Design a protein around this nucleic acid. Structure first.
Lengths: 141, 107, 53, 145, 143
RNA sequence: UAAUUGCGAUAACGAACGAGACCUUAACCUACUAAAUAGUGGUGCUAGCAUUUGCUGGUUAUCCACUUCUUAGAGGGACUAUCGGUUUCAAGCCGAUGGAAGUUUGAGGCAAUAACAGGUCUGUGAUGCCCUUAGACGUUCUGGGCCGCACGCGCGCUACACUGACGGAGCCAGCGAGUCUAACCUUGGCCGAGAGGUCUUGGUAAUCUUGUGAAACUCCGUCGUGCUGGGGAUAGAGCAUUGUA
């Protein structure tokens, strides 16, 4: 009756709403930060998308997302690379042109599954076969 | 209201072609003989939830075997028909095996 | 005329024997089948046949 | 918290349950060291004796190491439930006969002489000397058997 | 005034609020502590042999917000452990349910935790006050 | 070279099969006038701070539409190409590697040719086969051995550490049954040292035991490597489960 659309947008493996909240570099959404995690394993792995690229680099970008889907391991292994792509590529309107060109040329010799976003999607398989690496399960006679 | 249109989603589900052609020919000839709106059905990627009772205990030897597969040909109708004839489609052509999910959603 | 030809048979392997051919396998009570392994091959079109993989 | 300032009250090896004990361990481990008593029984009598775990062999000398043994022997006059332990209502009258040091290796054969008197399978399998708790040993048997 | 919805953490919270509750005197000990194994899937009881009830209390005290509600059917699972069936592999087995139910009931009677609708537990107002402001004050003190 | 695969000449010519003959794969469409269990703006006010609107019930024909993950049908990608030599280019090697794919497209399936004194006569009354019914060539019946070991062979693990421990987040995977005339029946509550014991909740269930939640990982205070903490195929007392047992 009314042309009321939900602003459906895409993400790595989930849905999103296409209405971003601009701000003054506030990496949070109004009641909770995410970045304070302290895992004791992947610390340098999370510092890699930022510490090698530029320490703060958040004077002109925020992350404003709430999505329920995908997975937790996918979330940790996807959102950091996602904002890395946001800060190195989407910032071409803002960041220095020679700086981003140097960065892309530096990462051309760095694409070793460290600057790759998780493009994984859930898929169902069919009943009748289960094997992946070993053999199947069949009887004699 | 009188002559309500709540649009319970009729869920056309069959196994064999003798019943599939039966129900599909039935609904379309019903539409043809009481002059329903001209909007026909198409099939679907069928709603298969994987459940089965396998009897293959131990894996010795080689494979001289088939595939355990079956297609429940759950299809649908894209139309704007009344809830009345949606109910009468279930009332007539009585055969146990056709399921109808109670879903108030037209399109 | 015999009195002692009865015997308790309600459960366990001693009560329920095969129905296929007086066979010697098939301790599977799926849907009350209790059908043999050669008998599953005697059965024709219950495998869901199709070959791509 | 607490700095070590103890003096030379640590003495030679003390006598207990007709054996020797190491003078380089907490008293709870010193009690577990003795046959007839283990970890849970040891710490049970310890935390029922209400002694802190920061005390070396200087404290709890032989004269202070009798309250513990006596409350271990007597669970009656102190409200020791004696059902958290194993042995209770075993064979005699119903009374809690808590396990003890020499009592165990003096009573381990009353059940056995009972069993071979009755001539049960637990007696005759033991007389054969084969495994008794129901494990199949057809193939091997090199060193024991 | 600038204080956000929460300023809570886990380890600072535990090892500070344990002594805080020891100062406040809220023991709520179930009586038969330090006699039991404390789990059906552990090797021995704890080695301190005195109390350790705040070690559970202040853990659940921020577990009750890190999860929206706390379920004992999953708590005893998460506290389960490995056990050996002799000459067999190690199997994960659930922890005790008796002590979990008893400490949960003890804190329910104390009035920190509370049974919420739709199945589960929520935090009462004393715990909510312990969550927001005094946690920030304690960590700003000890940091 | 994974191949009777390409060049090339010839008593050679033109034809099928093993691969080629087919499809499931692995990180796939701003895609399908496809469904209320997987969810998003406005939100129905906030019960966590209630002024720092994301949210708690999506106020049980429940704030609407739909798939953007539960159900997957199409056509579509990657090919050594744009570089040079390594065959005279007619094969083939490199690195700029180009991503739903530089290993043919990783892993999977056709028993192609024609044979085996090969396992199945004891497999469905299947083969010119030796013998019977009263002492049935024993159909059935009271039960129990079918795991007895002087011996060796064979795939499977419990340890021979300061790697044994408390506290916690570590939990990111589809997997499977259900009375219809007998055992699947609670996520939660309560008792217990614990096997375990009782209730709205599960017989037509994506729906209820199932909202399947797979496990030890880093840590410090302390004991603490030893035939002792490294454990239990070894022996004893009591607590009960599935099963007449």
């Amino acid at each position: 009756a009314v042309p009321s659309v939900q602003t459906f947008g895409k993400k790595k493996s989930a849905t999103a709403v296409a209405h971003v909240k601009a701000g003054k570099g506030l990496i949070k959404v109004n009641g909770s930060p995410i970045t304070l995690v302290e895992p004791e394993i992947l610390r340098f792995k999370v510092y890699e998308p930022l510490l090698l690229v530029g320490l703060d680099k958040f004077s002109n970008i925020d992350i404003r997302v709430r999505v329920t889907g995908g997975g937790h391991v996918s979330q940790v292994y996807a959102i950091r690379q996602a904002i890395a792509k946001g800060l190195v590529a989407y910032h071409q309107k803002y960041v220095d042109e020679q700086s981003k060109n140097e960065l892309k040329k530096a990462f051309t010799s760095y694409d070793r599954t460290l600057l790759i976003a998780d493009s994984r999607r859930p898929e169902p398989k069919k009943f009748g076969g289960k094997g992946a690496r070993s053999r199947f399960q069949k009887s004699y006679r | 209201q009188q002559q309500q249109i709540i649009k319970i989603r009729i869920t056309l589900t069959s196994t064999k072609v003798k019943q599939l052609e039966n129900v599909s020919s039935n609904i379309v000839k019903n539409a043809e003989q009481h002059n329903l709106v001209k909007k026909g059905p198409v099939r679907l990627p069928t709603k298969v939830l994987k459940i089965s009772t396998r009897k293959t205990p131990n894996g010795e030897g080689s494979k001289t075997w088939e595939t355990y597969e079956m297609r429940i040909h759950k299809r649908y109708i894209d139309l704007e028909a009344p809830v009345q004839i949606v109910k009468r489609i279930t009332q007539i052509t009585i055969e146990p095996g056709v399921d109808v999910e109670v879903v108030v959603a037209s399109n | 005329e015999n009195v002692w030809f009865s015997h308790p048979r309600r459960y366990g392997k001693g009560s329920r024997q095969c129905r296929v051919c007086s066979s010697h396998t098939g301790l599977i009570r799926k849907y009350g089948l209790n059908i043999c392994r050669q008998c599953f091959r005697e059965k024709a079109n219950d495998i869901g046949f199709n070959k791509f993989r | 918290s607490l700095v070590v300032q103890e003096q030379g009250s640590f003495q030679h090896i003390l006598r207990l349950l007709n054996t020797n004990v190491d003078g380089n361990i907490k008293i709870v481990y010193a009690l577990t060291t003795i046959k007839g008593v283990g970890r849970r029984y040891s710490n049970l009598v310890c935390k029922k004796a209400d002694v802190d775990l920061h005390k070396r062999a200087g404290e709890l000398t032989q004269e202070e190491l009798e309250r513990i043994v006596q409350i271990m022997q007597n669970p009656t006059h102190y409200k020791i439930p004696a059902w958290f332990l194993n042995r209770q209502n075993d064979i005699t009258d119903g009374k809690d006969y808590h396990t003890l040091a020499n009592n165990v290796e003096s009573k381990l054969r009353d059940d056995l002489e009972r069993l071979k008197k009755i001539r049960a399978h637990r007696g005759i399998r033991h007389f054969w000397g084969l495994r008794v708790r129901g494990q199949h040993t057809k193939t091997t048997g090199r060193r024991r058997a | 005034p600038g204080v956000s919805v929460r300023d809570v953490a886990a380890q600072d919270f535990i090892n500070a609020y344990a002594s805080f509750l020891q100062r406040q005197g809220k023991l709520e000990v179930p009586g038969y502590v330090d006699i039991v194994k404390t789990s059906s899937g552990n090797e021995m009881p704890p080695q301190d042999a005195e109390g350790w009830f705040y070690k559970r209390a202040a853990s659940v005290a921020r577990h009750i917000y890190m999860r929206k509600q706390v379920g004992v059917g999953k708590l005893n699972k998460l506290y389960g452990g490995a056990k050996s069936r002799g000459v067999r592999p190690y199997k994960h087995i659930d922890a005790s349910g008796s002590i979990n139910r008893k400490v949960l009931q003890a804190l329910e009677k104390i009035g920190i935790v509370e049974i919420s609708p739709k199945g589960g537990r929520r935090i009462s107002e004393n715990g909510q006050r312990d969550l927001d402001r005094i946690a920030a004050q304690t960590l700003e003190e000890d940091e």
